[PDB]
Amino acid sequence: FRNNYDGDTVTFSPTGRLFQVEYALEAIKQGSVTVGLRSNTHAVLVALKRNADELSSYQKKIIKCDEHMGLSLAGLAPDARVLSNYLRQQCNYSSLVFNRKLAVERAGHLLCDKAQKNTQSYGGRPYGVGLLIIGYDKSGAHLLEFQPSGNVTELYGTAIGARSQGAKTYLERTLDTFIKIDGNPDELIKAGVEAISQSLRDESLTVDNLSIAIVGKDTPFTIYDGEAVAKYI
Amino acid sequence: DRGVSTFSPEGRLFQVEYSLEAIKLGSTAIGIATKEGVVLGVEKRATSPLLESDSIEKIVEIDRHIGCAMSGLTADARSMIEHARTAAVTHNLYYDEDINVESLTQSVCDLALRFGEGASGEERLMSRPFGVALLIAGHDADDGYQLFHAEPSGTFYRYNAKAIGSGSEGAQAELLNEWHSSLTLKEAELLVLKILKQVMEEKLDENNAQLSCITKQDGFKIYDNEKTAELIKELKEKEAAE
Amino acid sequence: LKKGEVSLGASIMAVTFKDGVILGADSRTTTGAYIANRVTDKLTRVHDKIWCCRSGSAADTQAIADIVQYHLELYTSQYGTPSTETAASVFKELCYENKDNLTAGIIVAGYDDKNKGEVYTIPLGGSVHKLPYAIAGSGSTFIYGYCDKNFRENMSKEETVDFIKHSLSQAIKWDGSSGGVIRMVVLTAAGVERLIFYPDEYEQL
Amino acid sequence: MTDRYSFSLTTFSPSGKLGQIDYALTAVKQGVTSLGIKATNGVVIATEKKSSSPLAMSETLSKVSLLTPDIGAVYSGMGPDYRVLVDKSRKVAHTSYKRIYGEYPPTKLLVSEVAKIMQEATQSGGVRPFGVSLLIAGHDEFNGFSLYQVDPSGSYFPWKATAIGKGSVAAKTFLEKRWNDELELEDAIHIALLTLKESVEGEFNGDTIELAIIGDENPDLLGYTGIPTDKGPRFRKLTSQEINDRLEAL
Amino acid sequence: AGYDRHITIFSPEGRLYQVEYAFKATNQTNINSLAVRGKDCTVVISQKKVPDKLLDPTTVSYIFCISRTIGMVVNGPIPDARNAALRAKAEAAEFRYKYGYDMPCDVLAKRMANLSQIYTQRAYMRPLGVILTFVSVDEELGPSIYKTDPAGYYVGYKATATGPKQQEITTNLENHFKKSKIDHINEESWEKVVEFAITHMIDALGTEFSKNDLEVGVATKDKFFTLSAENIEERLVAIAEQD
Amino acid sequence: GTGYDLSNSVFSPDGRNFQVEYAVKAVENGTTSIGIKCNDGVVFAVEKLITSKLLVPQKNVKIQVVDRHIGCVYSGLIPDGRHLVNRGREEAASFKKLYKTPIPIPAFADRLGQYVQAHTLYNSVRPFGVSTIFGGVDKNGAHLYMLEPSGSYWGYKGAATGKGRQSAKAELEKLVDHHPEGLSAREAVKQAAKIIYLAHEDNKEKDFELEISWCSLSETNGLHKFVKGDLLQEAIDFAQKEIN
Amino acid sequence: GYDRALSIFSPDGHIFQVEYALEAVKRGTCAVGVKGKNCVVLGCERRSTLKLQDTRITPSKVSKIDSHVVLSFSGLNADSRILIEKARVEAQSHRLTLEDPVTVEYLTRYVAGVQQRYTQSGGVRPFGVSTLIAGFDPRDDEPKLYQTEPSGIYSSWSAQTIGRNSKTVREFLEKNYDRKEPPATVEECVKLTVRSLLEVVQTGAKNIEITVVKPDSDIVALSSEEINQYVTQIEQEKQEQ
Amino acid sequence: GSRRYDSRTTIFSPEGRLYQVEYALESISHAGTAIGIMASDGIVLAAERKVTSTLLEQDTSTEKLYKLNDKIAVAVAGLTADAEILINTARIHAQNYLKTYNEDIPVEILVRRLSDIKQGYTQHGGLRPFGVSFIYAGYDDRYGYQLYTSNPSGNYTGWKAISVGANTSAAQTLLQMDYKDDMKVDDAIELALKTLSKTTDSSALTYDRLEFATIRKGANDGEVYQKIFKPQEIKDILVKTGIT
Ligand SMILES: [Mg+2]
Ligand SMILES: [Mg+2]
Ligand SMILES: [Mg+2]
Ligand SMILES: [Mg+2]
């Protein structure tokens, strides 16, 4: 059965599944949790960072791609570096060549296409990392969810990682609320923090644990780590 | 058979996971970071008594402000060190300054997953992951003394103290208990020596273990056997008290 | 133009009319003052009803037409009959992309049922210009006035053959690089008609 | 995408056998019988035109091919593989010889060239050997007449007479009895016709047989007159009628 | 070792299974075609079977216009047939450009056959599951039919048939030619040749056809063309008088 | 023996290419999308599944344009469809650059067909996991095409693919029988919204979002435009009407 | 085009092809090198599977890399030739660019690097060769002896041996070589070396070939006879007791 | 993917042996035997022909003894065609050396180069090895008469007398018996033929089943002379020695 149809991404199973891609989707499911949510003026990313021992640092989950775009990762970090680096480049090309800020919708389309190429050719391997992209462009605030299968979706809020389903329900409920926190950054963040705190279990979110990112109207993508997230626990 | 960049049903890259197993069969390496420097110590582990121990290179200089210890298939680390040194020097050339330790480490880890058979994405030629892990330690003006553990997965974590190699589970455990935000360079040297002594198969002496440290003032220095022996002696005495 | 290569010189023109379009040309090629061929055919078929008048380098224009004929034959096999605008674009792509090594002044003329007759002139740089009629070749300078004064849109076949016959004889008269017989190719719904006019006729008009 | 098959498809098995070459030799064995006989003043290569239906036009399938004006080939095995080998042989005769020395190659060298193409298919990445054995007959100023057989492995050897394919064993036997070094070409053609008769199943006539000779120069087939150094091609394919005239003197 | 049935390497009996299986694929469409030569024409008939009512009948064809002079009918899956069609069209055009004259039907056949042979020998290329019958009225040869297959084989025919009921058609045709003693239909108009063709396909498959059940292509000097439904009906309407 | 289904280009003993057939299965597990050709245009419609309320409504557009006159919609692995459209775009541009006129629909079809078929020739590539319905308006009429993972394609009067393909094809056969005259782009837009709604029953467990687009010589000018605003709601209503 | 990963990790963390390369080394003739106070001697046993050879020509087992450094090996003969040529070329390239011949450590590091590269490059198998490299650094007199293996690992040795039965002779050396009085003479160094190979070669004169390397490009391959004189004197410090 | 069909021709067995090399050696062990014997005044190369008949032209044949230079020749044991590939590159290396230095190429240099080529097919490339073993007979101003042998692994060695192909164990035992360091060419020829005579897998040793060659320095000249015996010369030398 399996070891027959799961050795290469180039192999379709008898039911039309791509196992390597599905196995890629799994590495995301064991990564730490991160939340994304947006109002009509700001988009925030909240991510629970995970350590290896109590003597190590908490691996970063958020990466700035331009002054108006960034993302949080879950899964294989190196892959996130590869993809966020591509995003950085594409963003840069738009500014240099057209003096235009890259649209999040466009960024999403590009990420999909890059991931797809790795799912139709032999020898390669799908990317094993998920990303939540937030950005503020000409059409307002945005949140996008990228999956290694190549499926990119634009959302109001969401979450990925282990126990993601927890925060995914809080947001699914709190929608009518947060989608209206306009002109109030700290609130949106708080909403995000509340959302992320619904997928916890092990410990409580601490100053070494939390990572938040916010972008919006008059706010360039800025990352708040440790020291400056104290006011949100 | 089955590809080299294949994902397991659990979402782990086979070769990378199998790579980490080869690392568990290597000599122990310990680095401890304080506020007066970072100490790196390694277990030499010669295959026979006719081997001139000083030809065993497991702690290497990357640049005056960065040194590193290895564990695993030590031969695989030669290309890594080469890249590390070239990256540090090149940065000095392009920017007339010292490369940040994190940057040096990230550059090294960028090599990691560059393995495969025509893996559609870019040109990655290396038939398999590296079979060695590194402890990279150094100092830069922005983040001070730092120690990093660089794995063949491409991930690297900063640690206050870290052990890699065969006796790492045991050693790491001792590290967890002995490390504190106010250790001194001498205290650190001692611990590395002590912990190395615990997990090693052979009795630790100045010929089968090696120390080194990296400090703002003097940079990377591998401790000469004589300096270490005095430290080993200084240890036998501190332990024989209570 | 490369040192010593055969030149078309020429007096060529393509004129659209009521029933379609007519191509005309003299028949002289030269190498210096020697007339290498006094009876050449500068009206080249790239498709059943898409022809061109060639001027500039004989080598270049033949190479280009040969390639166009091929592109249109393959286009036809796959997508059906090509429009004159398409035939022109192919000529242009070649003339423009290779402007540094070629000397080809080409006039493309063709007949379609939806568009009637059409004329496109591709001058030395590879730019394309659609017009009711075009004149080119070294002899063309001498008839800019005559042609502008006498051309009328929607002329009849008889009238267009006469207009082309008079213009070219004038061009041939003044240009040492033009001469021979006057050749015409009439492109209409009825088919393709080849006309030829000799010196004893056109010279004393 | 891309030919990632850069490894050999023919490898040595534990017994020292090269699987693919043996299997190609088997493919050859199921082929129609073809033979060649070397006389004192010529060589004859013959084969049977196994028409796979009567609606097919046998003439449009030349199993006997001219490689150079003094060299011809016939085969047994996979027809398409032969057709491409002929194309390549005709070409190499020009590229590795006529365009260098101004003259067509000698039989043994053309043979050596074909044999090399066959060997490469036995070792190059991503290919299977050719499933054919050829009989190449020709003439050249310094060696006279020759006949060679080339196998899938690329090995070639010269013969006085031989046969390959289906009834090769029985045919080689008939050849060993009838052959002697004082045969004029007509007698070899005759023996070729006899040998082929036993290999052939049904109708045996000029339209089901293909015979070619390498003999005297044929000026009437040059196409021009005036240059006396080149006297004509030595290769000549016998016509349907030419074969029947000889079948009656059986 | 046992993968000798997946790629084009020899099986212990000297067979190329992949080529054999490519031959079975040519029957996947359950369509039969035949080709006969007139005194100065070549006609190819091919059944046309449009199942789904949602389809645009005008786009379902297995007969291709390769060049002004050459026509090709394919027996086999449409994607491979169209792959072959594109290549044959490119080859015929290139030939004209490089050599100054129209590529002959038989040469195109040989070229396409050589290409198939390559898929037969190199392991990376799979054979195309189709049989190509090229027809035309060659300027040197006259009416012509040359057909190629996945093995890389090709040959010229007096008449030919291809498809699941290949044998019945072939036998019917063989019988007619044995009875008449010539290598072509002795009729002057391609219309009658087309008629003969249809009649004999009916006689052989034991089936009656309507206008939307056939596909016809005719090759004449300087042109090859497919018949419209209405032309086919004129043909059908005329055959309904001998029978 | 077995194993004829582990590598792409391999012919099975019965002449089938199993990897292409498994691709088709990925198509059958996807959303339904259709295409209806009309008297002077084509209409495309697709069912978009609402995985959750968090999806910003009307933003994850699925139908795509090629050049300015071709619409493309597909069912299956969305990314593969995007890949296919990216090529179509390069292919359409190439054609325009060399020939000036925008790419004819039959020519575009084959361009897509040849690329898809190319992916069934080697074991180094996976076939396309999508069926694409596309078409538009050109020099001589409207054209609707549907292309399968095998690279097979033909022209259609109506076309549907995805989970509800059968219901859709059912409803489509009705339309083609009742209106042989043609169908106004207006009516087709309505009918398309209907067919998707009815077809949506073949996946009645999730709420959905309708997406329609069209290309018509009279309503859009031979250019592809999405059905937005008044025109869309009218079609949405006509649908929820003819359901009960 | 061929780039299949032949050297890959297996579930337990071993690189089979590199481990199987060590096995081919275990099957090659024994080689030993021990260093004196002012010399380094390299002994090698001769392949006795077949005999009737022409000793004059046959590729010797100890090869000169430069006038002051030599390399001996155990493993696939054919493979050793590739390592020897690359080392010889690098030796001349170094003289050309640095204006000083290679140190022995550098040369070792170079050969070792080549071996490691073949363990993680696609399409190639590792070298089934282990080597002993010895000589003296330019203008220096301290003897050097280094050992390299298929993995590319290398290090220096007071005395070391590789090849079949190396395990056995390694033991002999482990308890007959003292770093307090290393063979202070060419004579006693060769003696010890011969003693070691005798414990494995099984009474054979022509069976052993010795090569002595002294400072400043002085390398001499002792003759069958000169060694025989050693075997004799050795069977005496064994028979008198 | 494609990995599936790769036999991995350049891997080590768990015992450190090269599969393909060992297997090629086995192939070679079924080839006609070839012997090379080195005298004080010359070298003899003798070979027994494989796959023969009454109809094989022996006059115009050479499948075992090949000239590489006017001073170097080889005897072949293995696949004739593989041999011809290697032979042609050796003939080119020879001329390359002559052009460069204006001196005939030393024998060992030519031998080592050929061996290195064989070794290559052993360590990289993924192609099967050449199934050929060579016995090289040659002369040069530095070592005089030399005899070498090379096999599929790429290893080469020098000999006073050697054999390759079938029944080597038997032949080597016989050579080692009758060979004496001071042999004269006329003696070596006899020994060569005698040895073949006793190790043949066939009835009796006849002329049509042999290829014979000698490289002598005829005292009445200077240039070394390579003689590839013609059919009638082998029949003759076979009578004198007493095999009839
Ligand atoms: Mg004039
Ligand atoms: Mg193939
Ligand atoms: Mg394949
Ligand atoms: Mg269907």
Among F188, F206, F194, CA closest to F241: F194
Confirm if D69 and D43 have CB atoms less than 8 A apart: no
CA–CA distances in Å: residue A149 to residues A130, E127, E139, F8, F148: 10, 32, 57, 20, 21
State which residue of chain H sits closest to B4, comparing Cα positions. H3
H60 exposure class (CB count in 10 Å sphere: 0-12, 13-18, 19+): middle
* Eight-class DSSP state of E212: G
What resolution, expressed in A, was reported for this entry? 1.9
Determine whether F31 is an active site residue.
Answer: yes
Select from G54, G63, G73 the residue whose CB has the most chain H CBs within 10 Å, as the one to mutate to test that interface: G54
Helix or strand or coil: residue G152?
A: coil
Backbone torsions φ then ψ of G163, nearest 5 degrees: 105, -175
Q: What is the C-alpha to C-alpha distance for residues F180 and B116, in angstroms, rounded to an integer?
A: 58
Residues in chain G closer than 8 A to D4 (CB atoms): 1
Diameter of chain G measured on Cα atoms: 65
Residues in chain B closer than 8 A to A55 (CB atoms): 159-162, 172, 175-176, 179
Full DSSP string of chain F: ---TTSSTTPPPTTS--HHHHHHHHHHHTS--EEEEE-SSEEEEEEEEE---TTBPTT-S---EEETTTEEEEEEE-HHHHHHHHHHHHHHHHHHHHHHSSPPPHHHHHHHHHHHHHHTTS-TTBPPP-EEEEEEEEETTEEEEEEE-TTS-EEEBSEEEESTTHHHHHHHHHHHHHH-TT---HHHHHHHHHHHHHHHGGGGTTS-EEEEEEEEETTTTSSSEEE--THHHHHHHHHHHHHT-
Q: What is the C-alpha to C-alpha distance for residues G17 and E99, in angstroms, rounded to an integer?
A: 56
Contact D125 G2 (CB under 8 A): yes
Q: What is the C-alpha to C-alpha distance for residues D238 and E235, in angstroms, rounded to an integer?
A: 45
Nearest CA distance, G20 vs chain D (angstrom): 20
State which residue of chain F sits closest to C88, comparing Cα positions. F99
State which residue of chain F sits closest to A143, comparing Cα positions. F56
CA–CA distances in Å: residue E156 to residues D51, E136, E143, E150: 11, 12, 11, 16
Contact E113 D60 (CB under 8 A): no
Residues in chain D closer than 8 A to F125 (CB atoms): 1
Q: What is the C-alpha to C-alpha distance for residues F234 and F213, in angstroms, rounded to an integer?
A: 14
Q: What is the C-alpha to C-alpha distance for residues E48 and E234, in angstroms, rounded to an integer?
A: 17
Residue D54, domain CATH? 3.60.20.10
Residues in chain D closer than 8 A to G1 (CB atoms): 3-4, 6, 125
Among G129, G153, G148, G167, CA closest to G23: G129
User: Which residues does chain D break after (C to N > 2.5 Å)?
Assistant: none
Return the half-sphere exposure (C-beta side, CA atoms, 13 A cut-off) of residue D109: 17
Structure tokens at A147: 């999956």
Q: CB pairs under 8 A, 24+ apart, for C124-128?
A: C124/C56, C124/C99, C125/C95, C125/C96, C125/C99, C126/C92, C126/C94, C126/C95, C126/C96, C126/C97, C126/C98, C126/C99, C127/C92, C127/C96, C128/C88, C128/C89, C128/C92
Q: What is the C-alpha to C-alpha distance for residues C190 and C202, in angstroms, rounded to an integer?
A: 26
List F2, F31, F101, F220, catalytic entry: F31
Chains that touch E (3 or more CB pairs under 8 A): C, D, F, H
Q: What are the domain boundaries of chain C?
A: 1-205
Q: What is the C-alpha to C-alpha distance for residues A165 and A158, in angstroms, rounded to an integer?
A: 9
Nearest CA distance, C72 vs chain E (angstrom): 9
Q: Residue H188, Cα to own-chain centre: how many angstroms?
A: 16
Residue ranges making up the domain that contains F38: 1-244
Q: Residue A72, Cα to own-chain centre: how many angstroms?
A: 4
Q: What is the C-alpha to C-alpha distance for residues C76 and C81, in angstroms, rounded to an integer?
A: 5
Q: What is the C-alpha to C-alpha distance for residues F166 and F195, in angstroms, rounded to an integer?
A: 11
User: Computed from CA positions of residues A186, A192, A193, A195, in that sequence, does the dihedral angle turn out positive or negative?
Assistant: positive
Across the beta sheet with D156-158, the strand order is D65-68, D71-77, D132-140, D144-150, D156-158
H132 forms bridges with which residues in the sheet?
A: H78
The conformational region for residue A149 under phi > 0 = left, psi -120 to 50 = alpha, else beta, is alpha
Q: What is the C-alpha to C-alpha distance for residues F170 and F152, in angstroms, rounded to an integer?
A: 22
Q: How many interchain CB pairs under 8 A, G with H?
A: 105
The CATH superfamily assigned to G1-241 is Aminohydrolase, N-terminal nucleophile (Ntn) domain (3.60.20.10)
Amino acid present at H32: G
Q: CB pairs under 8 A, 24+ apart, for D179-186?
A: D179/D37, D179/H55, D181/D40, D182/D40, D183/D37, D183/D39, D183/D40, D184/D39, D184/D40, D184/D41, D185/D39, D185/D40, D185/D41, D185/D42, D185/D44, D185/D213, D185/D215
B31 forms bridges with which residues in the sheet?
A: B40, B162
Instruction: Look at strands B59-63 and E154-156 and give their pairing.
Output: unpaired
Look-up of token digits 């042109």: E223
Confirm if F119 and A121 have CB atoms less than 8 A apart: no
Nearest by CB to residue E153, choosing from D24, D55, D80, is D80
Is residue H1 within 8 angstroms of chain B, CB to CB?
A: yes
Q: Residue E132, Cα to own-chain centre: how many angstroms?
A: 5
First to last CA, chain C: 33
Q: Ligand 1 centre and the CA of G205: distance in Å?
A: 105
Backbone torsions φ then ψ of A201, nearest 5 degrees: -175, -55
Confirm if D136 and D148 have CB atoms less than 8 A apart: yes
Q: CB pairs under 8 A, 24+ apart, for A175-181?
A: A175/F53, A175/F54, A178/A37, A178/A38, A178/A39, A179/A38, A179/A39, A179/A40, A180/A39, A180/A40, A181/A39, A181/A42
State the ligand closest to the CA atom of C180.
Answer: 1
Among G196, G164, G163, CA closest to G177: G196
State which residue of chain A sits closest to H1, comparing Cα positions. A122
Residue B152, domain CATH? 3.60.20.10
Backbone torsions φ then ψ of D241, nearest 5 degrees: -65, -45
Q: Residue B118, Cα to own-chain centre: how many angstroms?
A: 31
Structure tokens at G147: 């050992």
Q: What is the C-alpha to C-alpha distance for residues A93 and F197, in angstroms, rounded to an integer?
A: 42
Q: Helices A164-178 and A185-196 sit at what angle, rounded to 10 degrees? A: 150
Q: What is the C-alpha to C-alpha distance for residues H193 and H48, in angstroms, rounded to an integer?
A: 10
Which one is the CATH code of A1-233: 3.40.630.30, 3.60.20.10, 3.40.50.150, 3.40.50.2000? Answer: 3.60.20.10
Neighbours of E179 (CB within 10 A): 7
Q: What is the C-alpha to C-alpha distance for residues D212 and D147, in angstroms, rounded to an integer?
A: 13
Helix or strand or coil: residue B196?
A: helix
3+ Cβ–Cβ pairs closer than 8 Å linking H and C: no
Q: What is the C-alpha to C-alpha distance for residues D123 and H85, in angstroms, rounded to an integer?
A: 11
Full DSSP string of A91-120: HHHHHHHHS-PPPHHHHHHHHHHHHHHTTT
Residues of G engaging B, defined by a Cβ cutoff of 8 Å: 3-15, 105, 112-113, 116, 119-122, 146, 151-160, 170, 173-174, 177
Q: What CATH number has the domain spanning H1-244?
A: 3.60.20.10
Nearest by CB to residue E54, choosing from F9, F110, F159, is F159
Q: Ligand 2 centre and the CA of D126: distance in Å?
A: 9
Is residue F126 within 8 angstroms of chain A, CB to CB?
A: yes
Contact H55 D160 (CB under 8 A): yes
The runs of H, that is alpha helices, within D14-75 are 19-29
D144 exposure class (CB count in 10 Å sphere: 0-12, 13-18, 19+): middle
E203 exposure class (CB count in 10 Å sphere: 0-12, 13-18, 19+): middle
Q: What is the C-alpha to C-alpha distance for residues F91 and F108, in angstroms, rounded to an integer?
A: 8
Helix or strand or coil: residue B65?
A: coil
Amino acid present at G225: E
User: DSSP strand E in chain D: where?
Assistant: 34-38, 43-48, 65-68, 71-77, 132-140, 144-150, 156-158, 161-164, 209-214, 235-237
Nearest by CB to residue B127, choosing from G8, G159, G160, is G8
Q: Name residues whose C-beta falls within 8 Å of residue C192's C-beta, 6 or more positions apart in sequence.
A: C48, C49, C185, C186
Select from B45, B55, B130, B208 the residue whose CB has the most chain G CBs within 10 Å, as the one to mutate to test that interface: B55
The method of structure determination was X-ray
Residues in chain F closer than 8 A to D4 (CB atoms): 124
Q: What are the domain boundaries of chain A?
A: 1-233
Confirm if G127 and H124 have CB atoms less than 8 A apart: no
Diameter of chain E measured on Cα atoms: 62
Q: Residue C188, Cα to own-chain centre: how many angstroms?
A: 16
Across the beta sheet with B38-43, the strand order is B161-164, B29-33, B38-43, B209-215, B219-222
Q: Name residues whose C-beta falls within 8 Å of residue B160's C-beta, 6 or more positions apart in sequence.
A: A55, A56, B32, B33, B147, B179
Neighbours of D183 (CB within 10 A): 21
Q: Ligand 3 centre and the CA of E132: distance in Å?
A: 23
Confirm if F13 and F1 have CB atoms less than 8 A apart: no
Backbone torsions φ then ψ of D197, nearest 5 degrees: -55, -35
Q: What are the domain boundaries of chain H?
A: 1-244
Q: What is the C-alpha to C-alpha distance for residues A211 and A222, in angstroms, rounded to an integer?
A: 11
First to last CA, chain F: 54
Q: What CATH number has the domain spanning C1-205?
A: 3.60.20.10
Confirm if C172 and C24 have CB atoms less than 8 A apart: no
Q: Ligand 2 centre and the CA of E154: distance in Å?
A: 18
Confirm if C136 and C123 have CB atoms less than 8 A apart: yes
Q: What is the C-alpha to C-alpha distance for residues D178 and D187, in angstroms, rounded to an integer?
A: 10
Helix or strand or coil: residue D221?
A: helix
Q: How many domains does chain F have?
A: 1
Is residue G2 within 8 angstroms of chain D, CB to CB?
A: yes
The conformational region for residue C22 under phi > 0 = left, psi -120 to 50 = alpha, else beta, is beta
Q: What is the C-alpha to C-alpha distance for residues D214 and A42, in angstroms, rounded to an integer?
A: 91
Run of H or E including E227? none
Q: What is the C-alpha to C-alpha distance for residues F198 and F243, in angstroms, rounded to an integer?
A: 7
E214 forms bridges with which residues in the sheet?
A: E47
Residue ranges making up the domain that contains D168: 1-250
Full DSSP string of C124-192: TT---EEESEEEESGGGGGGHHHHHHH--TT--HHHHHHHHHHHHHHHHHH-TT--S-EEEEEEETTEE
Look-up of token digits 């799908």: A126
Q: What are the domain boundaries of chain E?
A: 1-243
CA–CA distances in Å: residue G194 to residues A121, G63, G209: 60, 19, 9
Select from H4, H5, H19 the residue whose CB has the most chain E CBs within 10 Å, as the one to mutate to test that interface: H5
Q: What is the C-alpha to C-alpha distance for residues B79 and G121, in angstroms, rounded to an integer?
A: 13
Structure tokens at B231: 């430290």
Structure tokens at G109: 């590091």
Neighbours of G216 (CB within 10 A): 12
Q: What is the C-alpha to C-alpha distance for residues B86 and B103, in angstroms, rounded to an integer?
A: 13
Q: Ligand 2 centre and the CA of E8: distance in Å?
A: 5
The conformational region for residue B165 under phi > 0 = left, psi -120 to 50 = alpha, else beta, is left
Angle at G19 between CA G13 and CA G20, to 5 degrees: 135
Confirm if G122 and B125 have CB atoms less than 8 A apart: yes
CA–CA distances in Å: residue D244 to residues B31, D111, D210, D250, E33: 97, 31, 11, 10, 37
Q: Ligand 4 centre and the CA of E54: distance in Å?
A: 11
Among F8, F23, F17, CA closest to A18: F23
Among E47, E98, E55, CA closest to E74: E47
Contact C78 F99 (CB under 8 A): no
Among A180, A168, A181, A185, CA closest to A130: A168
Q: Judge: domain E1-243, CATH 3.90.1150.10.
A: no
Neighbours of C144 (CB within 10 A): 10
